[PDB]
Amino acid sequence: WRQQWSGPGTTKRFPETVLARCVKYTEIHPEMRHVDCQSVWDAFKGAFISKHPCDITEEDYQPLMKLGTQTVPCNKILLWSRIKDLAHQFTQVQRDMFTLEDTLLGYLADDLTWCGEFATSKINYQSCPDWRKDCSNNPVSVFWKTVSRRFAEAACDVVHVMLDGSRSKIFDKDSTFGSVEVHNLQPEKVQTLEAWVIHGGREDSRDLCQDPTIKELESIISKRNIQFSCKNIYRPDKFLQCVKNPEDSSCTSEI
Numbered sequence: 001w002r003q004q005w006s007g008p009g010t011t012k013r014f015p016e017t018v019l020a021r022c023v024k025y026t027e028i029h030p031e032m033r034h035v036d037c038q039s040v041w042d043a044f045k046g047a048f049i050s051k052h053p054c055d056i057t058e059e060d061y062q063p064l065m066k067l068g069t070q071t072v073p074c075n076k077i078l079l080w081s082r083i084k085d086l087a088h089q090f091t092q093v094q095r096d097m098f099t100l101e102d103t104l105l106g107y108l109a110d111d112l113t114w115c116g117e118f119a120t121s122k123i124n125y126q127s128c129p130d131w132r133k134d135c136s137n138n139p140v141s142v143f144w145k146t147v148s149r150r151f152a153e154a155a156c157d158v159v160h161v162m163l164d165g166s167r168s169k170i171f172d173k174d175s176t177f178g179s180v181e182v183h184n185l186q187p188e189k190v191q192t193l194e195a196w197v198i199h200g201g202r203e204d205s206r207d208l209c210q211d212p213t214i215k216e217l218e219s220i221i222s223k224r225n226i227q228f229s230c231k232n233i234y235r236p237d238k239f240l241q242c243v244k245n246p247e248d249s250s251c252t253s254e255i
């Protein structure tokens, strides 16, 4: 009966895009220069080619995880939930801190779609499974759960997280951040999780650190024996300007 999936198909020129991103990343990051980008592509394709794209497992991605092993300075991590573009803008100006997309494997996959099919060795450019409409264990969703659990496990000292203060659930306990990332923060390594709650422009300077879902996050973090801190980012434009030039007279010292 199944004639196609509900989601968009594999990114056009996905193979070229993965290989090119690997070459660019290993140029910019001489600490990953040991990587063989063709081997990385072959491991990536091997995770999902010739497999039914609702049957993918974390073990499928183990060859890729091995080749893309990277040590990230554990006290320099910025996590995010539903506000990736501002998190990226932040690490473009605070260049010693890392989101997952600043790691080799996150950089390879960012904003892409991919899948295969059981019958053949071909990449499916026509359609790929949507996580909700078709199946959760799809090539893209399984990749991100695999790599983000390792990223969260590795974080230490003070960990920061950006949250979207415009959403109905500023912290959604069932989001990928709330499931995979929060519950892989290890208390033996992590002292504090500090949330940066980004105002949208319709929160009227309310203190969103008192929001019910932030109180939920505080309780979950407290139960993992980690300290919780929360800061409102009232003006995300001015915040980035001040990260770039900390002496600009528009700067606050709220963060």
Ligand SMILES: *[C@H]1O[C@H](COP(=O)(O)OP(=O)(O)OC[C@H]2O[C@@H](n3cnc4c(N)ncnc43)[C@H](O)[C@@H]2O)[C@@H](O)[C@@H]1Cl
Pocket (backbone or CB within 6 Å): 079, 080, 081, 082, 083, 084, 100, 101, 109, 110, 111, 112, 140, 141, 142, 144, 145, 148, 174, 175, 176, 177, 178, 180, 181
């Ligand atoms: C750990 O959690 C972060 C994302 O958490 P979230 O709360 O924003 O997730 P969600 O909205 O519940 O699910 C989003 C879904 O998107 C996939 N995904 C993650 N990162 C990317 C990038 N960079 N590009 C495209 N798709 C992405 C993933 O399957 C999520 O489940 C996040 O930093 C890691 Cl996953």
Ligand SMILES: [K+]
Pocket (backbone or CB within 6 Å): 186, 187, 188, 189, 190, 191, 192, 225, 226, 227
């Ligand atoms: K701790």
